[PDB]
């Protein structure tokens, strides 16, 4: 009966590319980047790989680092936005977010970044999963546009995120976009209440 | 197609209350403590609280410890059933579990748990989560006897699996157990098959 809304982190409520990119730039002064303009892809890794030798694994260090995750800056008007769609009626609202595969610091820090934005009660929506189509919703807003894994007929509809790795990509036209938080998140929540 | 079972970790991989008691004793050898046979309820820190004053904080400081998740021990044929339930045709097996609201060092090590018993592939399969009714699957396999949430219809079907603080319970007929690894657990599934 309550709507149920899935919104993804990196890339939707924690700038990801912005943080990298800095990062990437701060500590390798001397290699070539990509500007996020020329992002294209979901892996940063792949494309930064095929900028040259060795740079898949340097980009990697960056965010296997301690801090990268917690210091990511919010996207504009993301906890905003998340904030007064947990607190709409009939509307329960999760974080759904894969961590990586080294696992020292990611899932710490991002349970930290949430309780930061969000506050300590916040935490109970948290769900961290490499698997999002086990995850049932009506609604999954993500900058991946490939979201696939063990349920081949995932519940949720998948809003797409405008990220810049993502927005040139001309989607499948019943496949639909949240083009950032200042777009009119609300008329899409409200196309799929009952 | 394939059958999806969510095992649960804390009670049913993991021997929690052994390994609190243990360790609750050696900390506060002064203290009284709840034996196994005793333990009456899920939650350990409200039969400690009715035993003795402030005993349900130092509970708490127990499993609030760093190495208190990873130093668990494996429940008896838990790795064993689980490595050789997911190699099983048309299965997939998640863990999924719910960490503590100090996540410091428990998200951490839960993953790194899960390393050590079932190597870096099986990370992949870890869902951390409060919720556990949104997530999907035909079966959870889970020493809780009150699974609530989100979503009033789950999709799965609820196995209980036996605990000290359970074993005594009287479930609603429908209602079904798993008594412990040794119990018939493929039965279980394939009762589930199409
Ligand atoms: O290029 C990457 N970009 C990225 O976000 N990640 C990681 C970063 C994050 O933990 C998880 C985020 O995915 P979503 O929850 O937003 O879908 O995948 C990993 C790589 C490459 C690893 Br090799
Ligand atoms: O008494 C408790 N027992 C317990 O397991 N936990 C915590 C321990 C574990 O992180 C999570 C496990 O639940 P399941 O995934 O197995 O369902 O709840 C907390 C308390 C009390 C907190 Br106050
Ligand atoms: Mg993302
Ligand atoms: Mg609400
Ligand atoms: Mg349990
Ligand atoms: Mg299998």
Redesign the interface.
């Known amino acids: 009966?309550?709507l149920?809304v899935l919104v993804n982190m990196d890339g939707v409520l924690a700038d990801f590319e912005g943080g990298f990119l800095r990062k990437f730039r701060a500590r390798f002064p001397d290699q070539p980047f990509i500007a996020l303009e020329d992002r294209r892809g979901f892996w940063v890794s792949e494309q930064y790989g095929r900028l040259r030798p060795g740079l898949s694994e340097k980009a990697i260090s960056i965010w296997e680092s301690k801090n990268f995750f917690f210091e990511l800056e919010p996207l504009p008007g993301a906890v905003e936005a998340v904030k007064e769609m947990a607190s709409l009626q009939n509307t329960?609202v999760?974080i759904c977010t894969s961590?990586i595969?080294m696992?020292?610091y990611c899932?710490?820090e991002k349970?930290?970044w949430v309780?930061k934005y969000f506050g300590?009660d916040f935490?109970?929506?948290?769900?961290?999963?490499?698997?999002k189509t086990?995850?049932?919703?009506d609604l999954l807003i993500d900058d991946r546009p490939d979201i696939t894994g063990?349920?081949?007929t995932p519940?949720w509809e998948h809003v797409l995120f405008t990220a810049c790795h993502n927005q040139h990509l001309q989607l499948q036209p019943p496949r639909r976009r949240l083009h950032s938080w200042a777009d009119d998140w609300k008329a899409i929540l409200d196309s799929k209440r009952p």
């Open positions: 009966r309550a149920r329960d999760f961590p595969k696992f020292k899932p710490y349970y930290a309780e300590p935490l109970e929506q948290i769900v961290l999963t490499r698997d086990v995850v049932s919703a063990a349920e081949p519940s």
